[PDB]
C-alpha cells in the first residue's frame, strides 16, 4: 500500500466552495483594479523637444483629460494652448504650470 | 478590467486551485485566436474613421430627426459629440475583442452611461442603432470570423445600453 | 497580463493600440503554448517542490522549526509550507500570464505589513523562496529555467 | 513686471525615492509675478535654495500695465 | 470674495498639491485612505461620467458638536473622579481650625 | 473636534453663561481623570503592534475564510490594510479616550466608515469582531479602570458600525 | 525602434528589461537580414512605385489635377509626387527599424497642420497612401506584403 | 533618445536618401552584435544587486573618509541616495549599451548632472571613481568581450561627469 | 525639536506662536535639564553600554560572528560595535532633542537600502538595538529609563 496522505499544507489553503455569483464577488471585491490598470504621467525627461516629443504630446493630452475629464477637440484647445504647450516642450514651465 | 488569461488566473485565485485541464483548455483557445484578434484589431484601427463614416451615415438616414433641428445630434456640438461616442464605442468593442472579455465594457464603458444619458436627453434606442450599425460596417471590413466576435462585444453594449 | 498592460497603456491615451503593441501580443500570444507547458510541468509537481523545499529550508534555517520558532510545530510548519504553496501558484499565474503582475498583486504590495504582523521573518521567506526556486528550476530544462527564475528572482527581491 | 526667470536647486531629505528626481531637483522656470511670493515660500518651506531670480517679461518701476 | 483664478490657484498653490503632484505629474485619483468618507466620496466622484449629474455629492458635513443624551458623566471613571473630589474638598474642610 | 473641556465650554457657550458650581465640578472630575488617561494612553502606544497581532490573531483564527483565498482579507493588499484599519480603530479609540469625548469618533472614523465598507464588500460584523477582540487586548494592558474607559470608546465604534 | 520602445518601457517602471523585452529584441535582430531585404526591395523599385500610385490616384482623383486642384499643373504634380516619393522612404525607414516612429516623428507629427497650410486634401492622402499600398504589396510575398502592409495602414489612418 | 538604426534612419533622413549599401552594412553590424549586446544585458539584470555591492564596497575601500562623519555619503539618507545614484548609472550603461548608441546618457543621466552634484556639494572626483569601480566589477561577470562594449558607456558616464 | 516644530508649524499658518505653544515651549525647555542630565549619564557609560551589548548580541545570535556571518572576522565585527557606537550617540541627541528627529534624520532615513547593500540582516539590528536599550535602561534610574527606552524602541521599529 504505501498510503500517501493530502499533505497538511493543502488543505491549510483551501478555499471554502464557491459557485459563479460567489467567485464574480470575490473577484471584485475591494478597491477597484482602476487603481492599479492605469497611467500617472510625469515630466520624467529633461531632453529638449526634438526628441522625446511624442511622450510630451502624450503627457499634454492627459493634462487635458485630467483638467477637462475627456478629448476637448470640439474645443479646439490645442490651439487654445498651443503656447502653453510650446512653452512646456522647450521646458520654461512645468507640468504644474501648464496645469 | 480583466482580459481572457486574467480571468482564468482570477478565477483560480478567488478558488485557490491550480490549473486544470479546463483551465489549460481556456487559456489554448485564448492563445488559439490570438493572430486573429491582433490582424482585427489592426484592421479597425487602420479604418475607425471610415467605419465611423459609414455607420453614422447609415443612422442619421435611417433617423434623418436626429440631425435636423429639435434632435439630440442636432448642432455641430452635438454632432460632433454623437460621433465621439461612436468612435468610445468603436474603440472599447476593439479593446474588448483584444481582451477576449467584456470586462473592460461594464468597468470603462456602460458604467454610469444610462443614467448619464437620461440625465442629458441622449436617446437610448437610437444609440443602440447606431452602434448596431457600426457592428454591420466592421463586420464587412474585417471579415465574418473576425466579424462574430467583434459582433459580441458590439451586441454586449447593445444590450448593457437597452 | 501583456494584453492587459497594452490596452491599459493604450486607454491612457486614449488612442488605437500602436502596431507595436499589436506585434508585442502577437510575440506573447506565439509563446502561449510553451508558457503553458512550463506553468503545466511546475503545477504536475506542486507537492513535491514544495516537501523539497520546505526541507531545505529547515536545513538552512533549523531554528525556524525548533521550539519557540515561528514555524514550530505540525500545524505552523503546514502554514508555512501552505505559504509556499500560495507563492508556487503566484508563480505558474506569472507564468502564464506573461509578467509579474498576479505575483505582485496578490503577494507582494504589503507583504512585509503582513510578515511583520505574523511575527513571520523576511529572510526566512528569502530563503524559502530560493529554496523553491532550486528545486523548481531542477525539474526544467535550460531555456525555462531562466524564465521560471525570473519571477522567483522577482518574488525574492521583494521580500528583501 | 509679470514674470520671473527662477533657477533654484531642491534637496530632498524626507526620503530616497525610488524615481530618478533628476527633474525635479535643480530646475529653471517662469512664474508670473503674483505667484511669485507663494513658490518662494514653498520653496524655501521644502528646504531648497533659491540659486537665481530674474526679470524677463516686465519692466521693474512700471505703475500701470502690471 | 475673489472669485474663480484666485480659487484655483488656492487649490495648486496648497501644500498638500506640492507633495503629493509636485512640478512634473498630471493630478490623478488618489483612492485616499484618510480622513474619514474621503474614499466614498471621491470614488462617487470619479464614478461619474461628465455631466452625469448636478446634485453637490458633499454639500456639507454635519456637524458633530453635540449628541442627545449620553453625557458621560455616569461613566466609571467620571464617577471615581466625583468621589475623588469629595475627598479633595473634605481634607480641605479638615485644613479649616476645629472650631 | 471636542475634548471635555471643549464640551463643557461649548453647553456653556450656547447659553452665553459663565462657568457656573456645575461646570467647575465637570473640569475638575476631568482634570483628576486626565493622569488615568495618560498613563492609558502611553501604555496603549507602547504596545499598539503587540494588540494588533493579538487582535487579527483572534479575528482570523475565528474567521477563518477571511484569509483562505477569495476572502476579503486574502492578499498581501487585502491584510495589510485589514490591519491598518485595525490600527486606525486603536489611535482612534485611543484619541478619544485620552479626550474624554467620543465626537472624535464620530467626525474621523464613523463618517461614511459603513458605506465605505459596503462599497467595498469589506464584512461589517467582522470588523465589529474585531474590534471586540481588540477591546480585549487592550484591556488586560491597560488596567480594569482604564479597561472600563476604553470598552466605552470600542464599545463606541462597534455600535456605530453595528 | 522596437529595442528604444523596449528600453523606454523598461524606464518608466525604472528596471532592468524583462526577459519578454529580451525574447522581443532577439526576435527583432533575428528578423534584421529579412526587413533589410524587404526594405532594399522596395528601394530598388522606387520609380516604379511612385509613378503606379501616382497614376491610380489620379485615375480615381482626377479632381487633383483637374483645374482647382492643388496638383494642377506640372510643378504642383512634380511636389505630389515628391511627397508620395517621401512617404515611401519612410515606410522603408520604419520597416528597418521594426516600428512606425520614423513615419511617426518625421511625417505624422504636424501633418494635418502642415497640409491646411498647403490645401492639400487629406482624403487625396489617404488614397494616394493606399494606392501606393497597393502597388508596393504586390511586389513583396505574403509574409512581406502583410508587415509592410501594417505600416501601410498605420499611415493611412494617421492620415486620415 | 536614438539607437544605433534610429541613428542610421536620421542621419540618411536628414539626406533625404534611402538606404544604400553602407547603411545596410552598418544595419548589418548591429544586428550582428545584437545577440552579444542582449545576453549581456540580461546577465547584468541578473546581477545588478551584486555588481552594485561590490562597486559601492570598493568605492568606499578605497575612499572611506566618504563615509566617515564629514564625507557626503555620511548618513543613512546620503549612502542610500549614493548607492542609489551607483544603481542608476548602471541600469543606464545597460541601456546604452543594449540600444548601442551614446544618447540616452545625456539626454537622462548626464543633463544637468553638474549643477545638481556641485549645487548639492557631491564630489565629482569619487563619483566617477564609483563609475570606474562599476565598471570593472561589471567586466568579470558580462565576458571578456561584452566587457569592452559596457566600458564604452562607462567611460562615456565618466568623462560627461569628469 | 519641539521649538522647530512648534515654528514650522506656526510658519505653516503664516503666524505668530500662540500661547499654547510659548507654553510648550517653556515646559520643554524646563525638561531641558533633566535631559542632559541623562544624556549626560548615557555619553559616560559610553564603552560599558557597548561592550555588554555587543557580547549579548553576539551571544543570542551566535551566526553573525560565525564563519559566513555578516560580522565575521576582527574588522567586521568592529565595524559592528562601530555602527553599536553610532546608534547610542544618535540615541543621546535625541534625549538632549526631546524627540526622534536627529535619529530620524541620521540614521533612519534610507537604513534599510543601506543594509541591503552592506548584506547586513535587519533582525541583527533589531537586537543589538534591544541589548543596547537594556544595558542602557539597568545602567540608568528609574525614571531615566522610561524615556531613554522610548528611542531605543523607536529606533528598533524603524529597523523593523
Ligand atoms: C468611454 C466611455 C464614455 C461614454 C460612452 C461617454 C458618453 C457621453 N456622451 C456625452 C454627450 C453626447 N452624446 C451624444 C450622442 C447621441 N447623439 C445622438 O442622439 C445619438 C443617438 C447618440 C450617439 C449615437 C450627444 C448628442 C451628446 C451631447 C449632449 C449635450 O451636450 O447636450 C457625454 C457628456 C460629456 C461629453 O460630451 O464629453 C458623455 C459622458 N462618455 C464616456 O467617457
Ligand atoms: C537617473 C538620472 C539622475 C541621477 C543619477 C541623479 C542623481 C542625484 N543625486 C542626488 C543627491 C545625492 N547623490 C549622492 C551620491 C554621491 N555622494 C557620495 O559622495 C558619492 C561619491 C556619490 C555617489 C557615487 C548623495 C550623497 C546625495 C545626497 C546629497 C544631499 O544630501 O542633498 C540628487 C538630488 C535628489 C536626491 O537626493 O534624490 C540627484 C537628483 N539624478 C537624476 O535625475
Ligand atoms: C480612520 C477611519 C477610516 C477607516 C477605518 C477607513 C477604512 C478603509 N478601508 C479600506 C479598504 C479595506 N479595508 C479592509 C478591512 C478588513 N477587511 C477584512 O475583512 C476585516 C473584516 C476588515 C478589518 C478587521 C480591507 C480588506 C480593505 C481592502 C483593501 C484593498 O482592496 O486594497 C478603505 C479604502 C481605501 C484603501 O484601502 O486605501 C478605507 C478608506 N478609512 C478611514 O478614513
Ligand atoms: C496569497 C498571498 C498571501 C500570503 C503569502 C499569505 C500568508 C499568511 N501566512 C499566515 C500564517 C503563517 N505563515 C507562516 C510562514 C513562516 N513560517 C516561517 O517562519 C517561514 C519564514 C515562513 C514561511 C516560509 C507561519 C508559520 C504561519 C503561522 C502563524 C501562526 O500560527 O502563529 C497567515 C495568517 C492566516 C492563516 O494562517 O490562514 C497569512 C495571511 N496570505 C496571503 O493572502
Ligand atoms: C550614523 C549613521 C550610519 C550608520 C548606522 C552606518 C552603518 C554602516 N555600516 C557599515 C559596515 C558594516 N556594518 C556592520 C554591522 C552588522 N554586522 C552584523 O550583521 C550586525 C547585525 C550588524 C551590527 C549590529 C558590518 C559587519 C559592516 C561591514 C560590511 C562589510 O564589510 O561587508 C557601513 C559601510 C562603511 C564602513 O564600513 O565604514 C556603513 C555606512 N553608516 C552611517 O553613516
Redo the contacts with the bound molecule.
Keep these: 500500500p504505501s498510503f500517501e496522505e493530502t499533505p497538511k499544507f493543502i488543505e491549510k489553503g483551501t478555499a471554502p466552495d464557491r459557485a459563479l455569483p460567489q467567485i464574480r464577488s470575490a473577484i471584485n471585491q475591494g478597491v477597484s483594479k482602476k487603481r492599479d490598470q492605469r497611467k500617472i504621467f510625469s515630466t520624467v525627461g529633461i531632453q529638449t523637444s526634438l526628441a522625446s516629443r511624442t511622450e510630451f504630446d502624450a503627457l499634454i493630452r492627459a493634462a487635458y483629460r485630467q483638467v477637462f475629464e475627456?478629448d476637448m477637440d470640439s474645443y479646439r484647445i490645442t490651439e487654445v494652448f498651443s503656447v502653453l504647450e510650446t512653452k512646456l516642450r522647450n521646458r520654461e514651465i512645468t507640468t504644474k504650470e501648464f496645469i | 478590467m480583466q482580459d481572457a488569461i486574467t480571468s482564468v488566473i482570477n478565477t483560480y485565485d478567488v478558488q485557490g486551485k491550480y490549473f486544470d485541464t479546463s483551465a489549460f483548455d481556456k487559456l489554448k483557445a485564448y492563445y488559439a485566436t490570438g493572430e486573429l484578434r491582433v490582424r482585427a484589431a489592426g484592421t479597425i484601427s487602420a479604418n475607425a474613421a471610415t467605419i465611423i463614416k459609414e455607420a453614422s451615415a447609415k443612422?442619421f438616414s435611417n433617423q434623418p430627426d436626429?440631425v435636423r433641428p429639435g434632435?439630440?445630434?442636432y448642432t455641430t456640438?452635438?454632432?460632433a459629440?454623437?460621433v465621439?461616442?461612436?468612435d468610445?464605442?468603436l474603440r472599447?468593442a476593439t479593446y474588448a475583442m483584444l481582451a477576449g472579455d467584456t470586462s473592460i465594457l461594464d468597468e470603462?464603458?456602460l458604467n454610469g452611461?444610462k443614467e448619464?444619458?437620461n440625465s442629458?436627453?441622449?436617446?437610448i434606442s437610437?444609440?443602440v442603432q447606431?452602434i448596431q450599425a457600426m457592428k454591420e460596417v466592421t463586420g464587412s471590413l474585417v471579415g465574418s470570423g473576425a466579424a462574430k466576435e467583434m459582433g459580441v462585444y458590439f451586441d454586449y453594449l447593445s444590450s448593457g445600453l437597452s | 497580463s501583456v494584453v492587459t498592460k497594452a490596452i491599459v497603456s493604450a486607454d491612457a491615451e486614449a488612442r488605437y493600440l500602436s502596431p507595436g503593441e499589436l506585434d508585442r501580443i502577437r510575440g506573447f500570444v506565439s509563446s502561449g503554448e510553451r508558457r503553458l507547458r512550463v506553468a503545466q510541468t511546475l503545477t504536475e509537481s506542486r507537492e513535491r517542490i514544495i516537501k523539497q523545499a520546505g526541507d531545505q529550508l529547515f536545513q538552512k534555517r533549523p531554528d525556524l522549526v525548533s521550539p519557540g520558532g515561528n514555524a514550530y510545530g505540525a500545524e505552523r510548519t503546514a502554514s508555512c509550507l501552505r505559504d509556499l504553496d500560495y507563492y508556487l501558484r503566484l508563480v505558474t499565474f506569472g507564468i502564464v500570464a506573461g509578467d509579474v503582475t498576479p505575483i505582485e498583486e496578490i503577494g507582494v504590495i504589503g507583504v512585509k505589513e503582513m510578515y511583520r504582523n505574523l511575527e513571520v521573518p523576511l529572510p526566512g521567506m528569502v530563503e524559502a523562496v530560493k529554496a523553491m526556486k532550486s528545486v523548481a528550476t531542477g525539474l526544467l530544462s535550460g531555456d525555462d529555467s531562466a524564465e521560471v527564475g525570473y519571477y522567483f528572482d522577482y518574488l525574492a527581491g521583494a521580500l528583501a | 513686471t509679470r514674470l520671473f526667470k527662477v533657477t533654484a536647486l531642491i534637496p530632498s531629505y524626507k526620503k530616497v525615492r525610488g524615481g530618478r528626481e533628476l527633474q525635479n531637483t535643480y530646475f529653471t522656470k517662469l512664474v508670473e509675478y503674483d505667484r511669485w511670493f507663494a513658490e518662494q515660500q514653498r520653496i524655501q518651506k521644502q528646504g531648497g535654495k533659491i540659486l537665481s531670480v530674474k526679470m524677463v517679461a516686465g519692466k521693474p518701476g512700471l505703475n500701470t500695465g502690471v | 470674495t475673489q472669485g474663480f483664478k484666485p480659487f484655483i490657484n488656492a487649490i495648486l498653490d496648497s501644500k498638500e498639491y506640492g507633495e503629493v503632484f509636485g512640478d512634473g505629474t498630471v493630478p490623478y485619483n488618489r483612492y485616499p485612505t484618510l480622513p474619514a468618507a474621503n474614499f466614498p466620496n471621491t470614488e462617487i466622484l470619479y464614478n461619474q461620467?461628465?455631466?452625469?449629474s448636478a446634485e453637490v455629492v458633499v454639500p456639507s458635513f454635519k456637524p458633530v458638536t453635540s449628541p442627545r443624551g449620553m453625557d458621560m458623566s455616569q461613566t466609571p471613571l467620571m464617577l471615581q473622579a466625583m468621589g475623588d473630589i469629595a475627598e479633595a474638598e473634605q481634607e480641605v474642610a479638615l485644613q479649616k481650625p476645629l472650631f
Aim: a positive charge; proline letters at 3%; hydrophobic letters at 35%.
Design positions: 475627456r | 443612422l436626429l434632435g439630440n445630434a456640438r452635438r454632432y459629440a454623437c465621439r461616442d461612436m468610445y464605442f472599447y470603462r464603458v452611461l448619464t444619458y442629458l436627453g441622449v436617446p437610437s444609440t447606431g | 461620467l461628465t455631466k452625469q
